[PDB]
Design a protein around this ligand. Structure first.
Ligand SMILES: CC(C)Oc1cccc(-c2cccc(-n3ncc(C(=O)O)c3C(F)(F)F)n2)c1
Ligand SMILES: [Cl-]
Length: 289
């Protein structure tokens, strides 16, 4: 069986929680805390290992943007540090291609990054690649057909509807069709041949809307909206279903977890996180042992 892992997040301050949800039975496990609290991080999995990337420790005793990469092994229930990134990246996006981790955008204080770097687990090494055409924090990232997409975000001045694609063999970014909605701090993932962008902040409101980009038609189509408006949500795919976790609706740090069934085009309440939080990192791997 495989679990949905949520790492870190924010409520009152940045959080160190690592908790795993089992869609088969509805259960939550609390697992080993992150060594350093962090919100605005991303999660990913490579070789059955869970990685937590970037973020920020918003704490009463100060605010520290994170360049950290840390690895969680479900077999041992232990976190280990990996090589740090070139730069702190709060409100980061990440994607995995061919066993490598791409770290995209994010902020360091008032620095809004367009830079991108790639981590190679085999060598515990980061290397910068071509920067994006746009500065993007709160950027959504997904991978389809070994191409990397950076979607929406905030450039330091404006929230963005724009999106762009990275072609690894050309080390080159190109713009794609923009979304039909401005979205910053959305959830972005892949399902089938489509990039989905769920929720976000448009500069005025948290969004419940959801749209998807078909790489073959180069067009975005709205699907059914989520049951909750949310920015700074976590998102993942577990057995062909999209799950969204937490976020902020303009009133409450949400504990709501919803899942999308593409065949019926419906969103369902699935479970509640143990506590409301925004800006988590989320990914899916094996059960501890
Ligand atoms: C929800 C907000 C009031 O408290 C937090 C706290 C910690 C992290 C986060 C977060 C996480 C991921 C992305 C974003 N980003 N990035 C840009 C933006 C924007 O405004 O453009 C946002 C937004 F969600 F906050 F919405 N934030 C939000
Ligand atoms: Cl923040």
């Amino acid at each position: 069986g495989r679990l949905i892992y949520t790492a870190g997040g924010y409520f009152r301050q940045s959080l160190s929680y690592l908790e795993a949800y089992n869609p088969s039975n509805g259960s939550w496990l609390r697992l080993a805390d992150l060594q350093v609290p962090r919100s605005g991080l991303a999660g990913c999995v490579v070789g059955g290992l869970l990685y937590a990337v970037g973020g920020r420790n918003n704490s009463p005793d100060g605010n520290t943007d994170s360049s950290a990469l840390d690895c969680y092994n479900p077999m041992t229930n232990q976190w280990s540090p990996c090589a740090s990134m070139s730069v702190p990246r709060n409100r980061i996006g990440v994607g995995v291609i061919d066993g490598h981790i791409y770290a995209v955008g994010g902020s360091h204080g008032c620095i809004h990054h367009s830079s991108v770097e790639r981590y190679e687990p085999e060598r515990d090494e980061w290397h910068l690649v071509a920067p994006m055409l746009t500065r993007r924090i709160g950027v959504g990232v997904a991978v389809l057909n070994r191409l990397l997409y950076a979607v929406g975000g905030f450039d330091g001045t404006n929230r963005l509807n724009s999106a762009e694609c990275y072609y690894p063999e050309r080390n080159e970014w190109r713009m794609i069709t923009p979304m039909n909605t401005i979205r910053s701090g959305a959830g972005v993932c892949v399902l089938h041949n489509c990039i989905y962008a769920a929720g976000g902040y448009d500069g005025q409101d948290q969004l419940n809307s959801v749209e998807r980009y078909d790489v073959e038609t180069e067009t975005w189509t709205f699907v059914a909206p989520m049951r909750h408006h949310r920015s700074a949500l976590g998102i993942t795919v577990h057995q062909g279903k999209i799950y969204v976790l937490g976020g902020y609706d303009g009133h409450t740090f949400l504990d709501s977890v919803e899942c999308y069934d593409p065949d019926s085009d419906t969103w369902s309440e699935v479970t509640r996180m143990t506590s409301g939080r925004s800006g988590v990192g989320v990914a899916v791997t094996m059960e501890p042992c």
